[PDB]
């Protein structure tokens, strides 16, 4: 079992974010290009079709702490969204409500978190929630 | 863990490179915490620079991966600490070893040559405004590589 340390894992995720993955409907990059701790990331999700999120772009902040990837990152939406598990006042994603965060594995990544959030936008309990108008963001 | 990594680790601890501390991580025998002293008479003199080194699964057929963790102004080092160095890319040989990599990075600090790495903004400043570039390297040594 060859374990890749945090900082080298995050450099792999940086390169992967620049090359893109799959169909591009989630993307990520470093928030500050001088952040040698590789802690703060920008996330993007394209709302999935045939849902009330369709044709909307969501920006997120993903924080990979010192124990990442043994521990999950913290995730919060910047773009306002009505979605189960996303706090109405802060945009914070409640880890208990997102299976890949509640049952985190060290094989997961920023990519997986964003893909899973986009998948859950298709769930019956989210896809028909009436959404805020575009252009709103949470504080901080 | 391959016997080679065991032996290299033991020799690095028993016979450290002058000016370099290098110790394995307590939880990952392929992960090394490194401190390189800024060489005398270089723009980095007086500084203590943290680096990290990782031996990937295909070591020693593949090169170690190494990055600065201390911010440094140097033609061969980028804003995230990644290092442009031939033996880390396509001039690696399994006859070389961790000690070679550490000595080579130390040598980069003693003799910054902006014509050596692939072209980049820092190297261009070292080429065209060397005096200012050296003062920036000295300033960043004070700010980031002292009491760190």
Swiss-Prot record, chain A:
Give the GO biological process terms: DNA double-strand break processing; error-free postreplication DNA repair; positive regulation of double-strand break repair; positive regulation of protein K63-linked ubiquitination; postreplication repair; protein K63-linked ubiquitination; protein polyubiquitination; protein ubiquitination
Q: Which UniProt keywords apply?
A: Acetylation, Ubl conjugation pathway
Question: What residue stretches are annotated with the UBC core domain?
Answer: 5-140
Q: Which SMART domains match?
A: UBCc
Transmembrane intervals: none
Source domain of life is Eukaryota
Q: Which CDD domains match?
A: UEV_UBE2V
What Gene Ontology cellular component terms go with this record? cytoplasm; extracellular exosome; nucleoplasm; nucleus; UBC13-MMS2 complex; ubiquitin conjugating enzyme complex
List the SUPFAM superfamilies. UBC-like
User: Its biological function?
Assistant: Has no ubiquitin ligase activity on its own. The UBE2V2/UBE2N heterodimer catalyzes the synthesis of non-canonical poly-ubiquitin chains that are linked through 'Lys-63'. This type of poly-ubiquitination does not lead to protein degradation by the proteasome. Mediates transcriptional activation of target genes. Plays a role in the control of progress through the cell cycle and differentiation. Plays a role in the error-free DNA repair pathway and contributes to the survival of cells after DNA damage.
Family under the similarity heading: Belongs to the ubiquitin-conjugating enzyme family.
* Protein's name according to its UniProt entry: Ubiquitin-conjugating enzyme E2 variant 2
Q: Which gene encodes it?
A: UBE2V2
UniProtKB/Swiss-Prot annotation, chain B:
Protein name per Swiss-Prot or TrEMBL:
Ubiquitin-conjugating enzyme E2 N
Assigned keywords, A-Z: Acetylation, ATP-binding, Cytoplasm, Disulfide bond, DNA damage, DNA repair, Isopeptide bond, Nucleotide-binding, Nucleus, Transferase, Ubl conjugation, Ubl conjugation pathway
What sections of the sequence does the record tag as coiled-coil? Answer: none
What does the record say mutating residue 89 to R does?
Answer: No ISGylation
Q: Which EC main class describes this enzyme?
A: transferase
SMART domains listed in its UniProt record: UBCc
Q: Which reaction does it catalyse?
A: S-ubiquitinyl-[E1 ubiquitin-activating enzyme]-L-cysteine + [E2 ubiquitin-conjugating enzyme]-L-cysteine = [E1 ubiquitin-activating enzyme]-L-cysteine + S-ubiquitinyl-[E2 ubiquitin-conjugating enzyme]-L-cysteine
Q: Where in the cell is it found?
A: Nucleus; Cytoplasm
Q: Which CDD domains match?
A: UBCc_UBE2N
* InterPro entries (UniProt xref): UBQ-conjugat_E2_core, UBQ-conjugating_AS, UBQ-conjugating_enzyme/RWD
Residues carrying N6-acetyllysine: 79
Q: Which GO terms describe its biological process?
A: antiviral innate immune response; DNA double-strand break processing; double-strand break repair via homologous recombination; negative regulation of TORC1 signaling; positive regulation of canonical NF-kappaB signal transduction; positive regulation of DNA repair; positive regulation of double-strand break repair; positive regulation of intracellular signal transduction
Q: GO MF annotations for this entry?
A: ATP binding; RNA binding; ubiquitin binding; ubiquitin conjugating enzyme activity; ubiquitin protein ligase binding; ubiquitin-protein transferase activator activity; ubiquitin-protein transferase activity
Instruction: Describe activation and inhibition of this protein.
Output: Activity is inhibited by binding to OTUB1, which prevents 'Lys-63'-linked polyubiquitination. Activity is inhibited by GPS2, leading to prevent 'Lys-63'-linked polyubiquitination.
Carries keyword Ribosomal protein? no
EC number(s) given by UniProt: 2.3.2.23
How does it get modified after it is made?
A: Conjugation to ISG15 impairs formation of the thioester bond with ubiquitin but not interaction with UBE2V2.
Name the pathway it acts in. Protein modification; protein ubiquitination
């Amino acid at each position: 079992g060859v374990k890749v340390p945090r900082n080298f894992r995050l450099l792999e995720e940086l390169e992967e974010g620049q090359k893109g993955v799959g169909d591009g409907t989630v993307s990520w990059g470093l928030e500050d290009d001088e952040d040698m701790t590789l802690t703060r990331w920008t996330g993007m999700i394209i709302g999935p079709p045939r849902t009330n999120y369709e044709n909307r772009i969501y920006s997120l902040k993903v924080e990979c702490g010192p124990k990442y990837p043994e521990a999950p990152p913290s995730v919060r939406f910047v773009t306002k969204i009505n979605m189960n598990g996303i706090n109405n006042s802060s945009g914070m994603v409640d880890a208990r409500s997102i299976p890949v965060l509640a049952k985190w594995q060290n094989s997961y990544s920023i990519k997986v978190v964003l893909q899973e959030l986009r998948r859950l936008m298709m769930s019956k309990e989210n896809m028909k929630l009436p959404q805020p108008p575009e252009g709103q963001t949470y504080n901080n | 863990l391959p016997r080679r990594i065991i032996k290299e680790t033991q020799r690095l601890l028993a016979e450290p490179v002058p000016g370099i501390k290098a110790e394995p991580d307590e939880s990952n025998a392929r992960y090394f915490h490194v401190v390189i002293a800024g060489p005398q008479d270089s723009p980095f003199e007086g500084g203590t620079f943290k680096l990290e080194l990782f031996l990937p699964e295909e070591y020693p057929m593949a090169a170690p991966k190494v990055r600065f963790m201390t911010k440094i102004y140097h033609p061969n080092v980028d804003k995230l600490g990644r290092i442009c160095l031939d033996i880390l890319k396509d001039k690696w040989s399994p006859a070389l070893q961790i000690r070679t990599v550490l000595l080579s990075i130390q040598a980069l600090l003693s003799a910054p040559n902006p014509d050596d790495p692939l072209a980049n903004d820092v190297a261009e400043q070292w080429k065209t405004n060397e005096a200012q570039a050296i003062e920036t390297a000295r300033a960043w040594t004070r700010l980031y590589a002292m009491n760190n």
